[PDB]
Design a protein around this ligand. Sequence first.
Ligand SMILES: C[S@@+](CC[C@H](N)C(=O)[O-])C[C@H]1O[C@@H](n2cnc3c(N)ncnc32)[C@H](O)[C@@H]1O
Ligand SMILES: C[S@@+](CC[C@H](N)C(=O)[O-])C[C@H]1O[C@@H](n2cnc3c(N)ncnc32)[C@H](O)[C@@H]1O
Lengths: 396, 396
Amino acid sequence: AQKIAVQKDVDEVVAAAQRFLHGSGTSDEAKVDLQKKASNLVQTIRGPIPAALSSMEDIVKVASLRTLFEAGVFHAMPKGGASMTASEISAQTGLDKGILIRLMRAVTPLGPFHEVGEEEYAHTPFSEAYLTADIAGCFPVMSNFIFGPVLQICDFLRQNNWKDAITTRNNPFTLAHNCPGETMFEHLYKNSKNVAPVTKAEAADVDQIAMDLYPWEERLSDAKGSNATLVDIAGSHGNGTRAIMALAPKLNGCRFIVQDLEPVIGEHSQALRAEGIEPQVYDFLKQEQPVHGASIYYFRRVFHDWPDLPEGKKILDNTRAAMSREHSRILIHDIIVPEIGATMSHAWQDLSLMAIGGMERTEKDFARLLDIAGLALVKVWRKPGDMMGIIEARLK
Amino acid sequence: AQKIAVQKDVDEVVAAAQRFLHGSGTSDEAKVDLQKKASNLVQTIRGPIPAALSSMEDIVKVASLRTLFEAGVFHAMPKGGASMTASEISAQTGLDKGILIRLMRAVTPLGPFHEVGEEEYAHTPFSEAYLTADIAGCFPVMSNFIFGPVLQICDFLRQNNWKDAITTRNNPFTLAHNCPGETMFEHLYKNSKNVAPVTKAEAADVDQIAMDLYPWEERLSDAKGSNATLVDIAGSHGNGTRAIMALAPKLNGCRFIVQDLEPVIGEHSQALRAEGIEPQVYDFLKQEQPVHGASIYYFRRVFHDWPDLPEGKKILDNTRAAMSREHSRILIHDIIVPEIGATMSHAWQDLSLMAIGGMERTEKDFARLLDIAGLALVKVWRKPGDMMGIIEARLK
Ligand SMILES: C[S@@+](CC[C@H](N)C(=O)[O-])C[C@H]1O[C@@H](n2cnc3c(N)ncnc32)[C@H](O)[C@@H]1O
Ligand SMILES: C[S@@+](CC[C@H](N)C(=O)[O-])C[C@H]1O[C@@H](n2cnc3c(N)ncnc32)[C@H](O)[C@@H]1O
């Protein structure tokens, strides 16, 4: 009875696989369809009622991965598939051997590790992937600061009878961390020991953001004299402008500034000075933009942290002050969420932001943000199959 | 390059599928292997680094399912696949339409719901499975009371430098719920509004526990006079003894008692009296077993809540007092965790128990529990491919 379903889902896996393996790098659409039919097959093998237990498996799995990562198990275990006993892991990390053995049961049956024998474990490339720069920056911060709040979205909205009371300073993050009134950045930066971990997470770029989407060379060159300036607003580490300076070196003596809050500027200031970009301490919620007439004010993965009102309009207004009507442009670089057919990649980013009062925006959402701030849309720049686009704006 | 891996994993999916579809109900081993190779295929399609993002997807997915379930979306949406708009769902549940739309992005791309159109959604059998009696009893309680603590296992053990400080009254549950000193049952039963939800979760039996594992007819019949008595200790709802009375009706006027704490006895007392079983208020940590010489003292899914010491030995000692040396036997009915090759089903149950100071036990773990309490093992009853067994004990 269930055998008939398994057989059909297997057929559709084989069909999507053959399609994927003979498309050309339609490759991304054939890849998502293959992934979707492969996931259907897992669910069909489990059946509806046992598959509803997957949430409880996923929770302990995440909990174990996070504990194993923070306790040094990933670092202690030998890379390349050589095996190691629970005793030796426990001896070198300090993690209780009894706990460790119980935790490994979540990450070996399918989990990214491999059970070589009784109390004997090995890395695979799926577990070593957590030691990689983007994962190692993103996963610890998410797991220590964001997963908790995300699970409490239900409790936050229950307090308001499932109405939207979420703000930037009153949200599942402030509930979980008991910091009502503090935005997420304020609370994290309060403890300087968090700044290095948090700035590294802001630098994580798993999707490898496409920076050649916009023509920086053509527009930055035509800027004469003082106009020839780019402001990376909340540019954090500066890698955004490093890419731009690497996409347009047919240049003049251009001014490249990266602005951010004081702790972030302090963490990166020397590395940034060293590549000829100047760091600036700036708060786009407390101050007007302190650089006038610049050719471009650039915003990458900043506006997904703030609702249209009040903060969204206040950022745009604070940099509206410094702009030239016909020589300055605002560039908003962020995910553009489709109105249909969004992926789990849209969903985990949007819903994690829901916890701190942010949101990933649709095209129509960007339209309101511009309208509400009295700006005209020059052009949306998107290279389809790219999640991000660049909203190019101007004073109208 | 990655195409070669996909192709091999597809081959192994097709191979395990053909094996599964021609085994006989080796069916369970062929079923787990098919599931494992199907899951490998998903991971291989994603690649190591993108698959490490699966924890963040799994977290928002669980968070959305829980919010959608608690807010009435599952109940409001039409069963059978008919579609419904975000507007109509919001109108009938009170859940903010904007939130709802963002939450549905976690549960339609693969999640159990179906995106029929823009802001248009339908049940599938995988989402309706959450309305089923076992899921509907288990998932809300887990999600409201247990998921939070599980994610804080890392924070609890960090406090002790990854040493095992977990007890029944000092654990990730007491940390998350800020109730140091209270065991999980004490804290939940404190609020009577939790008793009905919690007792229904204790009744959830997704795996459908095999009760014909032990020969109740043969042993209960030979008990003459006062010996002919079964005590379902922490029997809660009573379904355990309903099964036993349905596996052995070639009986005398046997005494069937279900013991449990006062709130649980109050919730079920009338239903239990109605089927000829007598409810008894009893606390196996504060009192000695108040029924003497009974043929069997039966413990189903109770000892996985308590460590060997102190509570494990104290339960056994408190019922040791009431036993007859050669006419009474203790039956421990619980999961038996293999020393190798455990599944995600072992792991989610064991690690969820870790949060409250419980644990699922191996065969060798049961041996210590018996030894430490001065008991001899008569026989382990296990029907392989059954996760549970029955540890039969006697005073030696
Ligand atoms: C998610 S990070 C994005 C950083 C960088 N543009 C990128 O894409 O990698 C958001 C940045 O905004 C900064 N930020 C938060 N609040 C700010 C404020 N009030 N004024 C200026 N920057 C702020 C944070 O310090 C952080 O570096
Ligand atoms: C996980 S339920 C298992 C119930 C039932 N035997 C079954 O398998 O469905 C554990 C039960 O132990 C009970 N319990 C917890 N602490 C107890 C105590 N100190 N004395 C007696 N019963 C207790 C709870 O009320 C709950 O009904």
